[PDB]
Design a protein around this ligand. Sequence first.
Ligand SMILES: [Ca+2]
Ligand SMILES: [Ca+2]
Ligand SMILES: [Ca+2]
Ligand SMILES: [Ca+2]
Lengths: 93, 93, 48
Amino acid sequence: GSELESAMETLINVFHAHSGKEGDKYKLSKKELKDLLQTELSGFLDVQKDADAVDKVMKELDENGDGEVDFKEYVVLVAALTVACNNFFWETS
Amino acid sequence: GSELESAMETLINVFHAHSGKEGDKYKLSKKELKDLLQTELSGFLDVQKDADAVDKVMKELDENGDGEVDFKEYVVLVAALTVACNNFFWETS
Amino acid sequence: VVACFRMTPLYNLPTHRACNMFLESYKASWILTEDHSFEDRMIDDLSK
Ligand SMILES: [Ca+2]
Ligand SMILES: [Ca+2]
Ligand SMILES: [Ca+2]
Ligand SMILES: [Ca+2]
């Protein structure tokens, strides 16, 4: 019915809440994104070791060259991470 | 957080549901895709109401031209649009 | 995985920009490496 809408609105709540507390209320700055990911995923992320890796991934993820991660870009990347997790599921054997 | 993880999990659940609904292995035929769409997003989305849109979306989703959709394509584009809707809502409407 | 999601592909690049860099690369490797020794011939011919 509206379960994908539920998932999408949960996504919105989470990343907006993680943006606001740390920086500009809406978009995803570098520090916002770093703490956000820390909040988001544990036991799977390899970016935890270095925040400079977060910085450079932010630099790429900001092909627009503004230093702030757009919502569309972030959602497409986390969709690629869904891709990676499904690949993980298949790799399991 | 783990809630966002569960959001990806919900995406995967809904995908595999209609990938096997018509038995299309793990990939959405035109019919599976249509039924999927009007199931997950009742309202803002239209497939039955807009069959020409369904056909154009068949071509656009299937840039490869296979006519079937795997996880990467729709996750990217559908996530982008469905999240950007509310971003526009906040911005202006 | 995010290290490669960028993927910065060459095949998507516009033709003119790709050609402009191809000329640079070709000049840098092939033409520059190519070795021609004409000094001896030129000096002998001029001296004669
Ligand atoms: Ca922000
Ligand atoms: Ca950006
Ligand atoms: Ca299928
Ligand atoms: Ca396709």
